[PDB]
Structure formats: structure tokens, C-alpha cells
Amino acid sequence: TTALVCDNGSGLVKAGFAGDDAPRAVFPSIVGRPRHQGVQKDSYVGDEAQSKRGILTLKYPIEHGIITNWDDMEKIWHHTFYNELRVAPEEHPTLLTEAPLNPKANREKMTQIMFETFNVPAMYVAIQAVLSLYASGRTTGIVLDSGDGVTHNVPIYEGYALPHAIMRLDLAGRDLTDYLMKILTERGYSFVTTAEREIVRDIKEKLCYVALDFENEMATAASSSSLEKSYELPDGQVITIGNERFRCPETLFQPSFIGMESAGIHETTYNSIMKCDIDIRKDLYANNVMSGGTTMYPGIADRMQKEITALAPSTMKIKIIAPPERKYSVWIGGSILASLSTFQQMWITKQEYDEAGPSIVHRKCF
Amino acid sequence: KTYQSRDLVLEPIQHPKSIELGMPEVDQSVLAEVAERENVIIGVRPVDEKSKSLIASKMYSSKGLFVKAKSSDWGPMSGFIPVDQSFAKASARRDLEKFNEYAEQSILSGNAVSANLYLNQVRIEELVSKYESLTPLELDVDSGMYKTTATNGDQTIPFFLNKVTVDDKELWQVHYLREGELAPFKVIGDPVSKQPMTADYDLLTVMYTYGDLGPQSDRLKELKDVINTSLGRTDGLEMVHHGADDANPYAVMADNFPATFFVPKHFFDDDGLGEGKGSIQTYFNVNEQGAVVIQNPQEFSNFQQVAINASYRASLNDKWNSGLDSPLFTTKRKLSHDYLDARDEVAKKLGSPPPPPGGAGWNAYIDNLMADGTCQDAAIVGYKDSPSVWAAVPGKTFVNITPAEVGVLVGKDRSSFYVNGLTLGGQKCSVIRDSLLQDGEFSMDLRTKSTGGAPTFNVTVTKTDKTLVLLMGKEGVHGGLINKKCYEMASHLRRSQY
Ligand SMILES: Nc1ncnc2c1ncn2[C@@H]1O[C@H](COP(=O)(O)OP(=O)(O)O)[C@@H](O)[C@H]1O
Ligand SMILES: [Mg+2]
């Protein structure tokens, strides 16, 4: 029997089989239900829901990393098992991922749904950042996970996330796409609709980068066309992307760009390290692992190296690891974990659930 | 230097030999530049060697979708798809009704036209002198055409070639005897350009970097347009077509090998396959134009592993028939070495007291906790009044727990132990979870801290009305197992008013 691995992303579900080096299914965490409640299908999931948005009211049940609507979440899992993976959930142990700091009531509800709704023989809930650390071949370090709806700094000791030291930033890829749409619209273009958001997301993913020195890069952009890139829009017209290439991901280091009064990702990394035991801090500084789609920007590891170096004691050995596969490292780490012989000891069995109820997840999964 | 990553071993190519390919070298250079600009790996199926000049002429169209009629390998129609399939290769000649129907249905469905066949002077010289596929041309004064016969296929059929001018080019139109009368020979042509179809550049596979994999086939369509744009042929004469025909139940080495692969230029650097791992041209045959020549299934498997290890993968959204034979072609066989190595590293890194109920003997409780072999240490400690160890495993850590250490565990302050941990029997521990005040749990999960590579162990402490139940796992034992065991013992103690 093969274990299933389902990464419940704020923007995208990444799902597949343990032992594989990539997910089989990647789709939007979206559920659509008819806008009129009166008299083909009662609900739609992912790409199908987005295409029928004129007919449906769309909901994002994991918008900020934490599941808020269980009826919509059950539709997402049903779609994942039956439509994407084409499997009978009752035949497979299932590894689910969860956000850092996921409330106790939420992980209990996730456990109850897997056993009572899907009848899985066994399951486990792992924190997303921990799996990314495992995908980098490590068990101790600090992960910066920036996804679609949320970003976290998660320090981890021998496979165990340290919740007292986790930092959350309420900004990730979705906010960067919206900010890019706004600063391009400021030039006289118009990027406001759902179809225009997809164009801007493509511009962001293809042309954006993190500047090593923002103020110097802004001066270079205003003095020459050396940083300019041309992009062909769907209508055939051409738009020049200049300083927006690096102003867009600059928001990760300067959240005031979108009116947020939060510290930047380099400052939350430092803060999270300092909340951990003195004895582990050198190991965290030497093992900063980047993960998630919003860490894909070229230049981000070199910028983090410079920023963390400026903050830390000058003798501190600092290392930033940004794997090529970091867009899927949470899923890959789950595949690694669920394919190990040690995982058979970690899963929660249906027998354990029948004895203890949903609160068994507090004891077994951390 | 030999290349080695896990079970992948590549010996350096000693004295590389030139390999004949059908794709013109000018087009190999174009594809090498596309692979660099687009940061992709492109594989193209072999083009028949004899069709090189037809493609190089840039006069013809190329084989599109929905064309099941066969090409010919003889006569003046060699390299083309004749409308009359009696002029095609041996397999079509022995199945005339089937293949003639495919040719006519391709025209009727608008996927082809019947076109005249014009050959250039280069082609007449190749067929007569280079390949000796045709007998020397003999002028037939009554028609003004040159008669010739094939030296393979059906050698009894005369063909007639006529000097014609088509758009300022001096070409040779092919004619034959149709029902005994001279008629222009017809080949399957493209429905838009009306030009005869030669072999196309049939893509074997495309491997992308991660910054191109995922939901957002659009990407492949865009890449195919870049390829045709860079090849610079007249509109309608494209060598690459959108979409792909069925996988087909066929094999034959000449159909998939020798394949020409085009890769980003970083592969040709001295650190191409890693840091001090060498260049790709050291282990694979690469020509002057940057074409990586893949000659057999074992080489294809090795190249695919090298590409996957470099984080280039075939898309999920794309459909390919990449394999042919099976020297380790399954998904399990082609797992990335970064995945397998990380799994290996993680697997390695993961590893007077009151009378108890039911009579007397707190040692029995320790024996119960230690029975299943998961724990190396266990203890029951009274924490009210003057704290003391009621029972513990002799010669371990918990037996030495002090009242000061108990005070830290149960103390009002729940944050000073995050500065640098706490101790249990003098052993330094870090706090992983403090649920001491959480209803229904009343527990703390910790992990010891040690030096160098000495193993560390998970610990759970659960608080009852009068006791602390402590447990330490052996190396590799997950914290969840220890927490569950500690909880169950604490629940039993709480039921007996302890
Ligand atoms: N190459 C890239 N450059 C920048 N952002 C990217 C890139 N690839 C993906 N993203 C962004 O990453 C986000 C999705 O990342 P992901 O880790 O899957 O999120 P989640 O797990 O929260 O669903 C989206 O906002 C997407 O636009
Ligand atoms: Mg995520």
C-alpha cells in the first residue's frame, strides 16, 4: 500500500503519493457554490470553479493557511482523492500538512474528517515548514515559508517545530500579485479583473527579482533602461517592466509598501531565532532554508544573506539554502517522511482514533 | 575523471566519433540557442539522413497531424508521402487498400492536399550519384523529359523528370505513367502552404526548470512558436507542429535513435554536472553545434537522470512517449538524486512515598512504562509539599531529579525556560511544547540537548493531582509515541485519585 501526501496550501493543493519526488496534482484551493439558492453539480473545486465564477460564489477555505470552512474543505479533499489522485481513501494511510500554529480544534476536526468521513486506515498531520526542512536533508534549522496567503518563520529542533518561536507575516504571493497590479495600474494601464490578475501573476513569476541593495537599484532604474524587460500582453500590446521587477518582492523586506506595519522577513527571521534556546541559535543561523512559491525570486538568498549578516553578531556563521524545488519542498518532505519505515510508528491508526477520539492528534503529532 | 552520483556511473568518452544526423547543422545551432534562451532541454527524434537536403532546401512543408499514409524510401519520391501508396515503402505496398484509403481520407478531411512534386538539382545529383537510388537520366525526345528507374523498390517502373521553373528556381517536376499515360506525380502536401510534406522535427520530450513547472499545453505551445520563429522558415513551411499524434504500438531503433538533445549552455561548463563533476560533453557525445546525441535506451536513461538531477523535468501537463525500451524507465527508477540523498540523511538523523493503588510497589509502574522497549528512562515524582522521586529507572537520569528542577517544571513562570532550556537530573533539555496548563493534556514535551553528534532524546512530563509522570524515549523514538504513553499512565493515576 502507498501512503498519500496532501499539502493543504492557502492557494494551491499539492497532492500525490509517498515515495514520488513530485506531486501528481497541483490545483487551486477554491470551492464554488451557486450564487442563487433555489433549483448539474452542487459544488465545484479548483480550475472548474474559477471558470464558472460567473455562475458561482467562490470561497477560499484555507485563505490564510488555517482552514475556516469544513464543508468546503471536505469538498477539496473529496476532489483530491476521487478526481485528482483517483484513489479510494479507505485503502491508504494519509499524511496531511498543516500551517504552523494551527489551532487545536482545527487539527482535531481534520483528524475527525479523515477517520469518520473518508475512513482512512491511518493518518498523520505534519507542520508544512518541518517537511521543507526534511526535503533539504536536515532536521534542525529555521525555515522561511512564503506561500500564497501567509508567510512564517519556523525554527525546528531535530524535527520538532518550536511553537513559542514561530513568527507569522500576513503577506505572501497573493499580496505581491495585487501590489504589482496596483503599481502597473499607477502607470496608466488597467489590471483589476480576475483575467488581468492572471496576466500580472505571470509577469511577477517571470520577471521579478530581489535587489541586493534596493536604494541603489532604484537609482540605477531611474538613470538607465538596463533593468527594463518587455512583456507581450494577450492583446498583442507591449508593456515595459522596470523598477516594478524589484519593487514587487521588496515588500517581503519592507511590508510598509502595502500599508502593513510589520517587520520584514529578515527581521522576523532574527526575532524567531532569538526566541529559541541560546544553545541552538548558531545552528539556526547556519541553516536558514527557504521554501514556498514566494521564495522563488532570483536574488532572494543573496539578499537574505546580506540582511541577516547585518543583524547578527559579526562572528556568526550564516547560511541561506534555497533549493531549486522549493516551490514543492513541503510536498517532497512529506513524501520523504511518509516513505520511511519510521513513519509506520508515527501514524495515528483507526484503532487509536476509536479509543481516544480526535484529541489523539495533540499527543501523536508534533 | 569518471562521473558518479549514487548508482549512476558515467565513464569519460575516450576519442569521440562523429555521428551522422539527418537534421541540417544550421537547424541544430538554432535549437541549441533556443534551449539556452528558453532555459529548457529539448529532444528531437531522428530525421532520416537522406531527407537532409529536402529540409535544407527550405522549399517544403513538414508532416502534420492526422497523416497515416507512409513515406517512400525509393525512386524520385524518396522522403515524400505519395498519394498513390503503391509508391510508398514496402509496408504500404503490401497493404495498398488500407494505405491508399489513409492518403485519400487525409485530403478529404482537410488535413492534406494532393500536390505536384518538384525536386531541386541537389536532389537529382544525390539520387543519381551520392545514393545511386536512380539510374542515370536519359532524355526521351518525344516528351522532352528524362526517363529513369529506381534501383530499389519496384525497378520496373519508369519515372519521367521535366525541367521546370517554379518562382525563379530551376526545378525538376516528377511525372509517371498513370493508367499508361504521362501524368504529374502527386504527393501529400500541407493544406495551407500546398507544399509537399517532408519529415518534421518531431519532439521526443521537453524538460523544464522549476520556475516553469506547475499549473501555469500553453508552455509547450509557446516553446513550439519560439522554435518555428527561430528556425525562420517562410510562413506555412514550419518544421514543428502544435499537438501530437497517438503514441502508436511500434518500436525500431531508427525511429527514436539517434536523438538530438539541446540543453542550456551551463551544462557545457567545467562544473556542468555539479561542482567538480565535469562537463556534459565529457560523458555524452556532443557535436560542434551543441547537439547532444543520444544513441540508445541506456544513454537516454542516463541523460534523463542527469537532467532530473539538475532540476529539469518533463511537465505533468505534457504528454510524451519517452522510453521505447526499459533500462530503468519507471518513475521509481528515475527519482532525483537530491530526493534520495535527503531521504537517506533524514532517515539517519531521525535515529516516604504514598502507596500506589492495587496494593503496594511503585517499581511495578516503572516496569509497566519500560515494558514495550520504546523508553530508556521513566519516573513517577511527587511534586506537592517536599518533592521527591517515588520510583525511577536505576542508573539513568530521572532518578536524580531535584526539587529545584521540579519547581521549574511546575512553576508559575512559563517563559524563562525558553532562554536556554531547563534540566532534568542535571541533563539539559529544550522545551518543545508547554501544554502544562492545557485542559485534558497537562503535559510538556522536551528534547535533550547534547554535544557533537551524540544522540538526543524526546521526553514527556504529564502532571496529575499529586505526581509528575516522566518518560524518555530511546534514540529514534518519536515524541508522539512517548507523549501518548505518558498520557495513558497519567490518566490511570488520575482515576485512582493520584
Ligand atoms: N517563480 C515564481 N516567482 C514568484 N512567485 C512565484 C513563483 N512561482 C510561484 N510563485 C507564487 O507562489 C505562490 C504559491 O506558492 P505556494 O508555496 O504553493 O503557496 P501555498 O502553499 O500557500 O498554497 C503564488 O502566489 C505564486 O504566484
Ligand atoms: Mg504552502
Author numbering:
A (entry chain A): 5 to 43, 49 to 375
B (entry chain B): 466 to 681, 728 to 862, 895 to 1041
What did the original publication write about this model?
ExoY virulence factors are members of a family of bacterial nucleotidyl cyclases (NCs) that are activated by specific eukaryotic cofactors and overproduce cyclic purine and pyrimidine nucleotides in host cells. Here, we explore the Vibrio nigripulchritudo Multifunctional-Autoprocessing Repeats-in-ToXin (MARTX) ExoY effector domain (Vn-ExoY) as a model for ExoY-type members that interact with monomeric (G-actin) instead of filamentous (F-actin) actin. The catalytic domain of NC toxins can be divided into subdomains CA and CB, with the catalytic site located in a groove at their interface.
To improve the crystallisation strategy, we designed a chimeric protein containing three fused functional domains: Vn-ExoY extended at the C-terminus (Vn-ExoY455-896, either wild-type or with K528M/K535I), a short profilin-binding proline-rich motif (PRM) and profilin (VnE/VnEDM-PRM-Prof). Using this chimera (wild-type or double-mutant), we solved two crystal structures at 1.7 Å resolution: (i) VnEDM-PRM-Prof bound to actin-ADP with latrunculin B (LatB), and (ii) VnE-PRM-Prof bound to actin-ADP without LatB. In these structures, profilin is bound to actin-ADP, the PRM to profilin, Vn-ExoY to actin, while residues 863–895 connecting the C-terminus of Vn-ExoY to the PRM are disordered. Vn-ExoY contacts actin-ADP via its switch A and C, but only switch C is fully ordered. The Vn-ExoY switch A disorder (residues 682–727) is close to the LatB-binding site in actin. However, solving the structure without LatB only slightly reduces the switch A disorder. In the latter structure, the NBP of Vn-ExoY is further stabilised by a sulphate ion (VnE-PRM-Prof-SO42-:actin-ADP). A SO42- ion is bound to the Vn-ExoY NBP via residues (K528VnE-CA, K535VnE-LID, S536VnE-LID, K554VnE-LID) that coordinate the γ- and β-phosphates of 3’dATP when this ligand is bound.
